[PDB]
RNA sequence: AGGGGAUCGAAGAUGAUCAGAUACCGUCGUAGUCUUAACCAUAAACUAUGCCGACUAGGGAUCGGGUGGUGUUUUUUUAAUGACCCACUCGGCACCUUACGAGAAAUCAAAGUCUUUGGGUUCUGGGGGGAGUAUGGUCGCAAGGCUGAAACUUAAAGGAAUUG
């Protein structure tokens, strides 16, 4: 009969189910985990301020070929290296 | 085992109006069974129903013309309070029109609109159309 | 390659992470 | 409702069981029939003849209610049908189809073997079922000679008799041509037996 | 299917199977009408003259428009023996 | 490999169909008759359908061939019916089984009483 | 002309039956599409949705083409067919004309009141086809119909002025999703509701009172 | 998917069967999968009918028949024996011909 | 089938079903007076065995149980009631 | 850890085979295969299908029990048997036909009674991978069992059926 507990007094066996399985919502987990703050290399925030290390062309996958002007950056606030990406044409000679 | 004897028989009732048949037998009968029966019959939607004497809980045979479409038994017997039987019924019920849903109030059994006049209200029982 | 070949080489190199870690207690 | 003439008479009854269509099939038969009469010993039931013959009425009753006789329909594919259906056929107004029914027939009206009956009749609604699988598709009713173990769906007012063989099928076909010109047709009055013959209808092996 | 005040609306009131007085609609088409003939006396069938039913598509289907039949016709006077309403 | 396709045999189905009187059974009448019936743009073709319309012919006078009906044998079956010369009572009562005779007396009265028993 | 065949396609050229309601009413097999061209001649078409299909055959590769099509007036009639020929408009022409022999009745209904000239449905009616089942419930005045444009479209031509809709299913592929949407309102005549409990006589089929005007030569 | 109701053979409600080893290639194969002829036949054959009642003494002795029972592995089986493949529809048929 | 009589149905297809399964379950055994004339009187018997049954007076054997009704030993008559 | 140890036979030894052939096939043969005492707790441990309860449909077979029969065999002589037959009925291993219904489909008498959504209850799952990995706890003599994450990565993986 669809095993969930019909009692009218199932309260509890029914709110400790859902509350066990919400866990298997990804992001309900990552929101209990704190891997905002945890993980990844903002904050937790929108954006982040750093300083280029290298500026890395990268080649695209299959099935494109191109070279995707690159930048690993260290994190300000934070100290991670991270490789982010130089929007549109050239656009890598305004950085070094 | 068994839980809900209401929910049996309001079983063997759909599942005689799903195959055509005019008269189906329940058993263990009960006392919610006759006065869920009985707003069920004066309203329309079975015909003259007889409890038969066993000794133990009886059987009842019902006598059902087709008017019906889904009788029904809500299974865990819910706290509905008067502000709430509007909600209940929207749910169930095809159209504002027609059907009822009947429950159990300390004023006896009966439908939402007999609730409404009388204006007492109760744990839910089950619905008829 | 074969899921119970596979499952072998989980275990056969699981074994091996003990040993190199008992040396370390 | 009835008149008290058109009771079974003894006539009938010597008429019936001369062909034995009292007899009916052996450790098969459908729930569908509570025609049956006390079991005969050793792999046979007996059917009840009057209930036969009731409905051998309320056949012709029905029959002869369609307003153009013509477009009434028997079909047999069996070979002990056969002829008893062309016969049937050019007494009545019912145009037959007999042998194969080639499928197609009650829709699709690009065929030309289409028609388009208010009414079917069918000897053995085994092996014309295919037929009542078509007048299922284009709401047409459909009264059948059945046996016993006969396939109940999809058709109305069955007849019980014997489609097993011999005299039985023309016979229960021949007492129903024989009704349906004693109904709103020129024919025989009270007691008058019918100069045709009930052999008429019959198989030919020869 | 009437209205505000009086007008009855909504074309085609539907039939109904005699047999379960379930409605029949427009594409059930193994539904079914017969029409039974009411003779006089001395036989003659009265063309014209009609005791008819309507049987669903369902009872067809399921082998019960025989027995359906019988039932519906004997209690309206087309029959006797036959048919037990007990079994 | 001889062996008529459609096209001839569909011309001598519906040939025969509305024209089996005149068409008798030879050859070179048909043949001649099929130029001025039908419309063949070939001269083989016209034989290749007479000599096979011929055929049909040759053995439709044996009783009838599937596929063509021209309606004259469909009554014709009619009034070549009858031969019943004994139809059933005679000499004696009508033999009946134990149960097949308590049926009677149930609904009924009047038939002739014999009823021997049955086993296996 | 036109030359009809099948008796009940005969019978509405002579002027015999006036409307389709009562081809309804003896749930008749119109096999034929003038019948309803003639008895409803305000329909209009819309074709909703084309996507080619290719089979793989052995020697060849055959990409043909797959239209569906809604038809239908203001009132009560939808059709809905759906045609696949070798070329395109083709496919609408043949699938306007198999939609039209689809048609089928559609009971309208008053919300929560009487008041005037029926908006919303019956009842509460769920068609399904295939995954795709579609809900359709009863709705006030003004509430307009409620569904994606595609269904919406067709409870337009149903005649449907309020309807709301939940629907279950992959509604991305439309074939299923009108064929359970146009089976909902194909429905709602199927509720046995108390106002349609009345008894009535069982009318005879103009097949037979007609029965002259009609069959063969 | 289910290419059976049979599954591989022949057991509901039983949950385990000794297994047989096959006659040809000795594979182990359960005995209710076991796929098994009845192999009967005389000691001599066609060619012998005369050679041996005549070479002999007695009225005709008459003769005896060999049995043993054969199983095949299903792999072996197909390979030659009474076997191969049907189409979906006639796999159902379970009478031997 | 689809339209019969629940509250009056047939006892002769009625005695056909199970004793539980009837309209309104009963018992189908019985009750037996059993006569040894070397005994003047009767003692009652059930239907249905277990106990191996003797006369008041004498060490003696009316019947043996089975499964089901009593194998009544040899020569015996009996009133059912 | 004792006994046992015929046969078959992971390791290993080999003869052939192949371009190679640590294999397939042939041959020897250790542990094993059996058993006593203790451990281990896993299998596609499968019906890949929770348990209790109600209901929803025909058909012939079959297992065990029970009821009926001026039924057949045995005979020694009715009997009592004992098997057989026929019918009914419970409880079982299954099977056929169906499809009112269900479903993505293959198919399902349940996988049916579901948007007309509620009989009672247990368990699990929430794209693919990373991974049944790491870690901690715990069980084991050991192999291993149990519980069991994340980082990162990725647009599909996937089911049934269709045509080639
Ligand atoms: C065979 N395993 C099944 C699994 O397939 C599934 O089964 C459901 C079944 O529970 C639902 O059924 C359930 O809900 C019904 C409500 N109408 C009534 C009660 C119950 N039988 C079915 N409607 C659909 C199946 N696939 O869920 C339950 C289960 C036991 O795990
Ligand atoms: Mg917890
Ligand atoms: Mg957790
Ligand atoms: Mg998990
Ligand atoms: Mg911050
Ligand atoms: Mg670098
Ligand atoms: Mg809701
Ligand atoms: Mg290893
Ligand atoms: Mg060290
Ligand atoms: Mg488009
Ligand atoms: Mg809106
Ligand atoms: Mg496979
Ligand atoms: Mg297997
Ligand atoms: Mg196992
Ligand atoms: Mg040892
Ligand atoms: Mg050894
Ligand atoms: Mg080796
Ligand atoms: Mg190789
Ligand atoms: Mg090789
Ligand atoms: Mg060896
Ligand atoms: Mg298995
Ligand atoms: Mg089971
Ligand atoms: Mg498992
Ligand atoms: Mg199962
Ligand atoms: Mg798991
Ligand atoms: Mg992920
Ligand atoms: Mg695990
Ligand atoms: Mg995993
Ligand atoms: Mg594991
Ligand atoms: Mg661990
Ligand atoms: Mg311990
Ligand atoms: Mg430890
Ligand atoms: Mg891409
Ligand atoms: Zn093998
Ligand atoms: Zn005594």
Redesign the interface.
């Given at each position: 009969g669809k095993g969930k507990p019909r009692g009218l007094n199932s309260a509890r066996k029914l709110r400790v189910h859902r509350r066990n399985n919400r866990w298997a919502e990804n992001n309900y987990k990552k929101r209990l985990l704190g891997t905002a703050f945890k993980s990844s290399p903002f904050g937790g925030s929108s954006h982040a301020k750093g300083i280029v290390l290298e500026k890395l062309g990268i080649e695209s996958k299959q099935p494109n070929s191109a070279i995707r002007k690159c930048v690993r950056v260290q994190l300000i606030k934070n100290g991670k290296k991270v490789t982010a990406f130089v929007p549109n044409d050239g656009c890598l000679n305004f950085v070094d | 085992t068994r839980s809900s004897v209401l929910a049996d028989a309001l079983n063997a009732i759909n599942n005689a109006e799903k195959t055509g048949k005019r008269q189906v037998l329940i058993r263990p009968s009960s006392k919610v069974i006759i006065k869920f029966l009985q707003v069920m019959q004066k309203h329309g939607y079975i015909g003259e129903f007889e409890y038969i004497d066993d000794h133990r809980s009886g059987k009842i045979v019902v006598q059902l013309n087709g008017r019906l479409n889904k009788c029904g038994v809500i299974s865990p017997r819910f706290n509905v309070k008067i502000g709430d039987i509007e909600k209940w019924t929207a749910n169930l019920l095809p159209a504002r029109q027609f059907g009822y849903v009947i429950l159990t109030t300390s004023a006896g059994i009966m439908d939402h609109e007999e609730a409404r006049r009388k204006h007492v209200s109760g744990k839910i029982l089950g619905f008829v159309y | 390659m074969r899921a119970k070949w596979r499952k072998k080489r989980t275990r056969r190199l699981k074994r091996k992470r003990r040993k190199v870690r008992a040396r370390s207690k | 409702s009835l008149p008290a003439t058109f009771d079974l008479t003894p006539e009938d009854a010597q008429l019936l069981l001369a062909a034995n269509t009292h007899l009916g099939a052996r450790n098969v038969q459908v729930h569908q029939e509570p025609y049956v009469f006390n079991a005969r010993p050793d792999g046979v039931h007996v059917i009840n003849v009057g209930k036969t013959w009731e409905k051998l009425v309320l056949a012709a009753r029905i029959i002869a209610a369609i307003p153009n006789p013509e477009d009434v329909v028997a079909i047999s594919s069996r070979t002990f049908g056969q002829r008893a259906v062309l016969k049937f056929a050019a007494h009545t107004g019912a145009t037959p189809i007999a042998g194969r029914f080639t499928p197609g027939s009650f829709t699709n009206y690009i065929t030309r073997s289409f028609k388009e009956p208010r009414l079917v009749i069918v000897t053995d609604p085994r092996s014309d079922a295919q037929a009542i699988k078509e007048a299922s598709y284009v709401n047409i009713p459909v009264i059948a000679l059945t046996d016993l173990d006969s396939p109940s769906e999809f058709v109305d007012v069955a007849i019980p008799c014997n489609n097993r063989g011999k005299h039985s099928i023309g016979l229960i076909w021949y007492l129903l041509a024989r009704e349906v010109l004693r109904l709103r047709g020129a024919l025989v009055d009270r007691t008058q037996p019918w100069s045709i013959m009930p052999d008429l209808y019959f198989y030919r092996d020869p | 299917m009437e209205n505000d005040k009086g007008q009855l609306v909504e074309l085609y009131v539907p039939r109904k199977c005699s047999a379960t007085n379930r409605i029949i609609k427009a594409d059930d088409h193994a539904s079914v009408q017969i029409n039974v003939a009411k003779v006089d006396e001395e036989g003659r069938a009265i063309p014209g003259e009609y005791v008819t039913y309507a049987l669903s598509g369902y009872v067809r289907s399921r082998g019960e428009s025989d027995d359906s039949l019988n039932r519906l016709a004997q209690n309206d006077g087309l029959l006797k023996n036959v048919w037990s309403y007990s079994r | 490999g001889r062996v008529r396709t459609k096209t001839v045999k569909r011309a001598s189905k519906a040939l025969i169909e509305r024209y089996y009187p005149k068409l008798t059974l030879d050859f070179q009448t048909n043949k001649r008759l099929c130029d001025e019936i039908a419309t063949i743009q070939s001269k083989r073709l016209r034989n290749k359908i007479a000599g096979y319309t011929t055929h049909l012919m040759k053995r439709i006078q044996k009783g009838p061939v599937r596929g063509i009906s021209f309606k004259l044998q469909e009554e014709e079956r009619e009034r070549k019916d009858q031969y019943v010369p004994e139809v059933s009572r005679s000499n004696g009562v009508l033999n009946v089984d134990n149960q097949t005779s308590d049926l009677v007396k149930s609904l009924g009265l009047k038939l002739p009483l014999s009823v021997i028993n049955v086993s296996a | 002309g036109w030359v009809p065949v099948t008796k009940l396609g005969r019978l509405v050229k002579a002027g015999k039956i006036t409307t389709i309601e009562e081809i309804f009413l003896h749930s008749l097999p119109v096999k034929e599409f003038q019948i309803i061209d003639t008895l409803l001649p305000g329909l209009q078409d819309e074709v909703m949705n084309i996507k080619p299909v290719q089979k793989q055959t052995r020697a060849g590769q055959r990409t043909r083409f797959k239209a569906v099509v809604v038809v239908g007036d203001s009132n009560g009639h939808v059709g809905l067919g759906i045609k696949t020929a070798k070329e395109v408009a083709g496919a609408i022409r043949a699938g306007i004309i198999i939609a039209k022999l689809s048609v089928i009745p559609i009971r309208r209904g008053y919300w929560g009141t009487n008041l005037g000239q029926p908006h919303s449905l019956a009842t509460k009616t769920t068609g399904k086809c295939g995954s795709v089942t579609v809900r359709l419930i009863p709705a006030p005045r003004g509430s307009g119909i409620v569904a994606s444009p595609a269904v919406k479209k067709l409870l337009q031509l149903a005649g449907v002025e309020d309807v709301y809709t939940q629907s279950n299913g992959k509604t991305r592929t439309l074939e299923n999703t009108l064929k359970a949407a146009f089976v909902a309102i194909g429905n709602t005549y199927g509720f046995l509701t108390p106002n349609l409990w009345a008894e009535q006589p069982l009318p005879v089929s103009p097949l037979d009172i007609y029965s002259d005007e009609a069959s063969a030569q | 998917p289910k290419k059976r109701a049979s599954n591989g053979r022949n057991k509901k409600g039983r949950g385990h069967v000794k297994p047989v080893r096959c006659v040809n290639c000795s594979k182990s194969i359960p005995k209710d999968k076991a796929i098994k002829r009845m192999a009967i036949r005389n000691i001599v054959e066609a060619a012998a009918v005369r050679d041996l009642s005549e070479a002999s003494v007695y009225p005709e002795y008459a003769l005896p028949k060999t049995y043993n029972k054969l199983h095949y592995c299903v792999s072996c089986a197909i390979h030659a024996r009474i076997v191969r493949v049907r189409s979906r529809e006639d796999r159902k048929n379970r009478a031997p011909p | 089938?689809?339209?019969?009589?629940?509250?009056?149905?047939?006892a002769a297809?009625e005695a056909r079903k199970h004793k539980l399964k009837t309209?309104?379950?009963g018992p189908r055994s019985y009750f037996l007076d059993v006569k040894c004339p070397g005994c003047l009187n009767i003692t009652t018997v059930f239907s249905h065995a277990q106990t191996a049954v003797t006369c008041e007076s004498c060490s003696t054997i009316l019947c043996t149980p089975t499964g089901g009704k009593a194998k009544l030993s040899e020569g015996t008559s009996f009133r059912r009631k």
């Amino acid at each position: 009969g669809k095993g969930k507990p019909r009692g009218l007094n199932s309260a509890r066996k029914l709110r400790v189910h859902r509350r066990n399985n919400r866990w298997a919502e990804n992001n309900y987990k990552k929101r209990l985990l704190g891997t905002a703050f945890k993980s990844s290399p903002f904050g937790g925030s929108s954006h982040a301020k750093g300083i280029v290390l290298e500026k890395l062309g990268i080649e695209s996958k299959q099935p494109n070929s191109a070279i995707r002007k690159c930048v690993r950056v260290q994190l300000i606030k934070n100290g991670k290296k991270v490789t982010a990406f130089v929007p549109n044409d050239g656009c890598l000679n305004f950085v070094d | 085992t068994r839980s809900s004897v209401l929910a049996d028989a309001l079983n063997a009732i759909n599942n005689a109006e799903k195959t055509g048949k005019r008269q189906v037998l329940i058993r263990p009968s009960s006392k919610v069974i006759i006065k869920f029966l009985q707003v069920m019959q004066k309203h329309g939607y079975i015909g003259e129903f007889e409890y038969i004497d066993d000794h133990r809980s009886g059987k009842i045979v019902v006598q059902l013309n087709g008017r019906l479409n889904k009788c029904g038994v809500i299974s865990p017997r819910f706290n509905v309070k008067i502000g709430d039987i509007e909600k209940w019924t929207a749910n169930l019920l095809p159209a504002r029109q027609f059907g009822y849903v009947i429950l159990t109030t300390s004023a006896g059994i009966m439908d939402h609109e007999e609730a409404r006049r009388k204006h007492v209200s109760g744990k839910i029982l089950g619905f008829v159309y | 390659m074969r899921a119970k070949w596979r499952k072998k080489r989980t275990r056969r190199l699981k074994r091996k992470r003990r040993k190199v870690r008992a040396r370390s207690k | 409702s009835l008149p008290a003439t058109f009771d079974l008479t003894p006539e009938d009854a010597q008429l019936l069981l001369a062909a034995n269509t009292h007899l009916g099939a052996r450790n098969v038969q459908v729930h569908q029939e509570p025609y049956v009469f006390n079991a005969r010993p050793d792999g046979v039931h007996v059917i009840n003849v009057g209930k036969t013959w009731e409905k051998l009425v309320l056949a012709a009753r029905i029959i002869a209610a369609i307003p153009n006789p013509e477009d009434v329909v028997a079909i047999s594919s069996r070979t002990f049908g056969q002829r008893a259906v062309l016969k049937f056929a050019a007494h009545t107004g019912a145009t037959p189809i007999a042998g194969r029914f080639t499928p197609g027939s009650f829709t699709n009206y690009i065929t030309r073997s289409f028609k388009e009956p208010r009414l079917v009749i069918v000897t053995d609604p085994r092996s014309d079922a295919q037929a009542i699988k078509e007048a299922s598709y284009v709401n047409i009713p459909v009264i059948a000679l059945t046996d016993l173990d006969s396939p109940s769906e999809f058709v109305d007012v069955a007849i019980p008799c014997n489609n097993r063989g011999k005299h039985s099928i023309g016979l229960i076909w021949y007492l129903l041509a024989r009704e349906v010109l004693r109904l709103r047709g020129a024919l025989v009055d009270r007691t008058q037996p019918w100069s045709i013959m009930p052999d008429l209808y019959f198989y030919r092996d020869p | 299917m009437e209205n505000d005040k009086g007008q009855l609306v909504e074309l085609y009131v539907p039939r109904k199977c005699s047999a379960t007085n379930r409605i029949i609609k427009a594409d059930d088409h193994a539904s079914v009408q017969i029409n039974v003939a009411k003779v006089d006396e001395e036989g003659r069938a009265i063309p014209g003259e009609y005791v008819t039913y309507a049987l669903s598509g369902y009872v067809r289907s399921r082998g019960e428009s025989d027995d359906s039949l019988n039932r519906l016709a004997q209690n309206d006077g087309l029959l006797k023996n036959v048919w037990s309403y007990s079994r | 490999g001889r062996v008529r396709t459609k096209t001839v045999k569909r011309a001598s189905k519906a040939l025969i169909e509305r024209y089996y009187p005149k068409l008798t059974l030879d050859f070179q009448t048909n043949k001649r008759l099929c130029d001025e019936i039908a419309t063949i743009q070939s001269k083989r073709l016209r034989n290749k359908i007479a000599g096979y319309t011929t055929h049909l012919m040759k053995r439709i006078q044996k009783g009838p061939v599937r596929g063509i009906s021209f309606k004259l044998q469909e009554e014709e079956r009619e009034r070549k019916d009858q031969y019943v010369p004994e139809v059933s009572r005679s000499n004696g009562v009508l033999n009946v089984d134990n149960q097949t005779s308590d049926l009677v007396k149930s609904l009924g009265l009047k038939l002739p009483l014999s009823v021997i028993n049955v086993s296996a | 002309g036109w030359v009809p065949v099948t008796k009940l396609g005969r019978l509405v050229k002579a002027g015999k039956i006036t409307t389709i309601e009562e081809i309804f009413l003896h749930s008749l097999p119109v096999k034929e599409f003038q019948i309803i061209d003639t008895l409803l001649p305000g329909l209009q078409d819309e074709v909703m949705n084309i996507k080619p299909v290719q089979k793989q055959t052995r020697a060849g590769q055959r990409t043909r083409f797959k239209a569906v099509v809604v038809v239908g007036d203001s009132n009560g009639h939808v059709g809905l067919g759906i045609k696949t020929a070798k070329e395109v408009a083709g496919a609408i022409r043949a699938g306007i004309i198999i939609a039209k022999l689809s048609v089928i009745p559609i009971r309208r209904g008053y919300w929560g009141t009487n008041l005037g000239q029926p908006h919303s449905l019956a009842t509460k009616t769920t068609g399904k086809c295939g995954s795709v089942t579609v809900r359709l419930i009863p709705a006030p005045r003004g509430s307009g119909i409620v569904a994606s444009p595609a269904v919406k479209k067709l409870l337009q031509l149903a005649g449907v002025e309020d309807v709301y809709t939940q629907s279950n299913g992959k509604t991305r592929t439309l074939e299923n999703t009108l064929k359970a949407a146009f089976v909902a309102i194909g429905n709602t005549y199927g509720f046995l509701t108390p106002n349609l409990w009345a008894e009535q006589p069982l009318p005879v089929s103009p097949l037979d009172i007609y029965s002259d005007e009609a069959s063969a030569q | 998917p289910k290419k059976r109701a049979s599954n591989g053979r022949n057991k509901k409600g039983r949950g385990h069967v000794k297994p047989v080893r096959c006659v040809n290639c000795s594979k182990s194969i359960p005995k209710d999968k076991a796929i098994k002829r009845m192999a009967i036949r005389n000691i001599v054959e066609a060619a012998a009918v005369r050679d041996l009642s005549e070479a002999s003494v007695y009225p005709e002795y008459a003769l005896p028949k060999t049995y043993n029972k054969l199983h095949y592995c299903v792999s072996c089986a197909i390979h030659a024996r009474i076997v191969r493949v049907r189409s979906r529809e006639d796999r159902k048929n379970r009478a031997p011909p | 089938v689809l339209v019969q009589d629940l509250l009056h149905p047939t006892a002769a297809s009625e005695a056909r079903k199970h004793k539980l399964k009837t309209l309104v379950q009963g018992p189908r055994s019985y009750f037996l007076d059993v006569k040894c004339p070397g005994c003047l009187n009767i003692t009652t018997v059930f239907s249905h065995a277990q106990t191996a049954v003797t006369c008041e007076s004498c060490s003696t054997i009316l019947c043996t149980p089975t499964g089901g009704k009593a194998k009544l030993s040899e020569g015996t008559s009996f009133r059912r009631k």
